[PDB]
Design a protein around this ligand. Structure first.
Ligand SMILES: Nc1ncnc2[nH]cnc12
Ligand SMILES: Nc1ncnc2[nH]cnc12
Ligand SMILES: [Cl-]
Ligand SMILES: [Cl-]
Lengths: 208, 208
């Protein structure tokens, strides 16, 4: 059932860097996850141009944002390309090892943490606000999997027998106790409008 | 030998929009082509993580910028993933039809032309400065091809029997008569430093 894996050394460093650095502009985590969803949505769209059955697992191409104050989670769901087990283990389809290096040398030469997305590892900005991230994903070529990590140098992967999702990726942010502003409808709306207003897919902010 | 193709209607519109709109900040074309090269370089890098023979066609991952005042060309060469014949014909691997729509409605709601890259069709910003663009490309799964267009609603594709390139994409900009500032070493340097200083691949500006 559950496999446990070590982050590679540079990804572990990136995560501590994100967790431990004093840096007040945390809201950018949402931009980077929406933009990740948008890239995933482009890929499956591009595939379907030549093969329409790629869309048998869901014709709709969207992003949903789902706050839940009970569980203290904010979930970003897309119906993009999704990830195979291999992708998930390989740093969630990112080039996280070289991207971290380029990111850390950009911090040397003047960059700040908000530019993380330019190095391909914007996913990890999730740890600006989450103490634990769960990613549920399904790619046409594989089963549904769940990846999880509370950082600390390791992550787990298991086949997911929760809710069948068809195709796509759910990023589930278990928010830190002091970052609950990102479950507030007005706050999420302000952030989407600020950093994500031209995303080319409909973004639905669910209500509670 | 030479096949001729019609641009789809929305891509033809995007190109006239780029060619005919009064818009002074043309230098952004270079950022968008370098960032296209950078995305291509990430892809082949990601592939090689699991299969190293993907790099048999060239281990080096770089961008070269090559001005030539004789021919009045500026060439952007990367050793990224490259494009198959199908990719080339399908709008150079972009989602140009939906990206144009999202781009044109972003222009409705306040965007300007410099934000073109956020809609996936930054390649076409090449027509800010070129009257004719030639793309030479080689992908591990296919032969070398040459795509060309002077806009006007059509493009051509032919197998390329010029110089074997190994793997990657050469974007050859035949500059408009009044845009030769982009062959000047000082100007290209200023632009790379301004918009592309954290690209994670070495960029070599060739000299003449
Ligand atoms: N939404 C997403 N889709 C595919 N791969 C991802 N890696 C991180 N986020 C992703
Ligand atoms: N440099 C590039 N590599 C692959 N596909 C592209 N489409 C446009 N530019 C490209
Ligand atoms: Cl929905
Ligand atoms: Cl070189």
């Amino acid at each position: 059932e559950v496999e446990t894996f070590a982050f590679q050394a540079e990804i572990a460093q990136l995560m501590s860097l994100i967790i431990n650095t004093f840096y007040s502009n945390k809201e950018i985590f949402l931009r980077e996850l929406i933009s990740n969803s948008s890239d995933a949505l482009d890929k499956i769209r591009y595939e379907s141009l030549t093969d329409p059955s790629k869309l048998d697992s869901g014709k709709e191409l969207h992003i949903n944002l789902i706050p839940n104050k009970q569980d203290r989670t904010l979930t970003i769901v897309d119906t993009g390309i999704g990830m195979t087990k291999a992708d998930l283990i390989n740093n969630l389809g990112t080039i996280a090892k070289s991207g971290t290096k380029a990111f850390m040398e950009a911090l040397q030469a003047g960059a700040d943490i908000s530019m993380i997305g330019q190095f391909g590892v914007g996913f990890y900005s999730a740890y600006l606000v989450a103490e634990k991230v769960t990613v549920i994903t399904k790619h046409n070529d594989d089963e549904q999997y769940a990846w999880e990590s509370s950082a600390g140098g390791s992550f787990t992967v298991r086949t997911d027998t929760g809710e069948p999702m068809g195709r796509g990726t759910k990023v589930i942010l278990h928010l830190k106790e002091d970052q609950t502003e990102y479950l507030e409808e007005r706050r999420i709306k302000e952030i989407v409008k600020k950093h994500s207003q031209f995303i080319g897919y409909p973004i639905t902010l669910f209500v509670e």
